[PDB]
Amino acid sequence: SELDQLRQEAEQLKNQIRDARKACADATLSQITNNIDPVGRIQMRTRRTLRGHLAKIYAMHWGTDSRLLVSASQDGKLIIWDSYTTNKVHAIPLRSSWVMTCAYAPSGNYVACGGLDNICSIYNLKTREGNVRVSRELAGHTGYLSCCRFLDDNQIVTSSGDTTCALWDIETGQQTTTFTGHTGDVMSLSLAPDTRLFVSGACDASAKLWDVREGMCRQTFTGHESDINAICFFPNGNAFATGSDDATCRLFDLRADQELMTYSHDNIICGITSVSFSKSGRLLLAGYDDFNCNVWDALKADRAGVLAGHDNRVSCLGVTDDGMAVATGSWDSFLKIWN
């Protein structure tokens, strides 16, 4: 009776949402963008290969200086590279071999990583004794760390396979806020430019927009037919894109509260591991389990180019803040810098 009367209310609500969304869908982005020039053929080339990892690379994150980047690997290490010269700044061997993710703090003073240990682990990069050491192990997740991002030196958001995300106070080592709502493994998060909101993508095939300060889901985006493996804010923070096992990426606008476009191709059958926009937002670069990364005109949905260098999954990618360079990490064990 009560499980019925609420589930009957659940649809009438779900309807109101579909219908309000439909009320706004007066035109399509591809109709709106129809008149502007194409970007033409984007042919980027490998300008660096980064060697040192002895096994698959899982994650990478550029520093805000657009010069150094961290990479996380199956070989149990993090490596911080000087992309301009190819030199290693640091090689950090980890306590748990099972890292899946890594983050560089905006300051440059810190990096974070973790995985099947279920512990986001913070590393201090400029000690009083000039060494690289663990300043904090953040326990509390009951599932694997899938992704994490700093707001500042003392705050970080984590996504977990326990299906929760969380915001931490690093000094006290406690979850300030827990973000419950996903019903399957969360796999990525991305912070909005102003660190006020963030989005997460899960194995429930939905993305959720969270209010960081309050601790709640404001909007929930569907459309995908399979796990969302990656997520990313468009540079002005009014939209984001997703990467899925269903072989598509999608653009989602916050204030329209719905999908605006799909990026796909009959010839592309495999899943997307990673996503990022160019600086202006015009290009959406996505990494694939077919060894390539595809470069999409985010406004027209056309395919603009391809980065074809790796010999195994492209497993992660980032664009630099100055927009000069794309980094790709691969299961082949190398990173590559493109432009």
Binding site: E2, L3, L6, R7, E9, A10, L13, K14, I17, A20, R21, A23, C24, A25, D26, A27, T28, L29, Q31, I32, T33, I36, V39, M44, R47, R48, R67, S83, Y84, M216, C217, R218, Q219, T220, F234, P235, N236, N238, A239, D253, R255, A256, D257, L260, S278, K279, S280, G281, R282, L283, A298, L299, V319, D322, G323, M324, A325, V326, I337, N339
Partner: protein, 61 residues
């Protein structure tokens, strides 16, 4: 369960109770943003190769 189905309904009420803009307006605001920042994006608007670290730049900090 009966807790967790009222939690859904309360959450759905939050999601319904936003107000929204036309997709026409949304798309236009994104399109306008890209055009404003096209000249600042090196992947669209290449910069001189002597200022590109990965092409021909020699001097650094």
């Amino acid at each position: 369960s009966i807790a967790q189905a009222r939690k859904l309904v309360e959450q759905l009420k939050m999601e319904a109770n936003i107000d929204r803009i036309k997709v026409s307006k949304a798309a236009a605001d994104l399109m306008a943003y890209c055009e404003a920042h096209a000249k600042e994006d090196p992947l669209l608007t290449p910069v001189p190769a002597s200022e590109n670290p990965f092409r021909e730049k020699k001097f650094f900090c």
